[PDB]
Amino acid sequence: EAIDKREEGIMVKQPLSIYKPDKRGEGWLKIKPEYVSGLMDELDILIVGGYWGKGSRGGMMSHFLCAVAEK
DNA sequence: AAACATTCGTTCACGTGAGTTCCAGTACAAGTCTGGTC
């Protein structure tokens, strides 16, 4: 239904769960279409440019600029 | 009366179960890099 209404996803919560600051995966869960395999459309695009990287990956092209073709 | 077969307590090797140490696989959390717009 969320996919029908063009929404991000759904959340599932446990009724007997207390509040715990800064804690993940205790009583709250999320489901998005991306997390389910096959439910998304993927794009095949070309790499037309590159950028240099920051500290952990310095002397290599870390991010890229992609382009689609013209019929 | 003498020779041969059987039996018995002993011995060794080999196999299997339980305890201990070490390492690989798994899980989770935090850190680091990136993307997009307003």
Side-chain angles (χ1 to χ4, degrees):
Chain A
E1 196 186 341
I3 289 154
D4 273 6
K5 302 175 146 321
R6 275 68 159 133
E7 252 153 26
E8 220 174 6
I10 60 162
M11 299 264 301
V12 203
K13 281 173 182 185
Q14 187 177 345
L16 307 195
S17 75
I18 79 186
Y19 204 95
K20 288 189 224 110
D22 203 355
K23 268 28 167 142
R24 174 151 31 201
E26 301 259 47
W28 297 9
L29 262 51
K30 36 159 169 155
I31 302 131
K32 288 189 193 193
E34 297 137 55
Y35 305 155
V36 196
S37 267
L39 256 205
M40 301 265 297
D41 303 330
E42 309 183 343
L43 316 97
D44 298 340
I45 58 177
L46 220 71
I47 279 174
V48 281
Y51 300 78
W52 299 100
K54 244 188 72 59
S56 175
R57 40 190 95 159
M60 70 191 72
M61 300 271 158
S62 37
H63 22 302
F64 303 101
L65 184 90
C66 319
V68 305
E70 227 195 0
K71 211 226 170 292

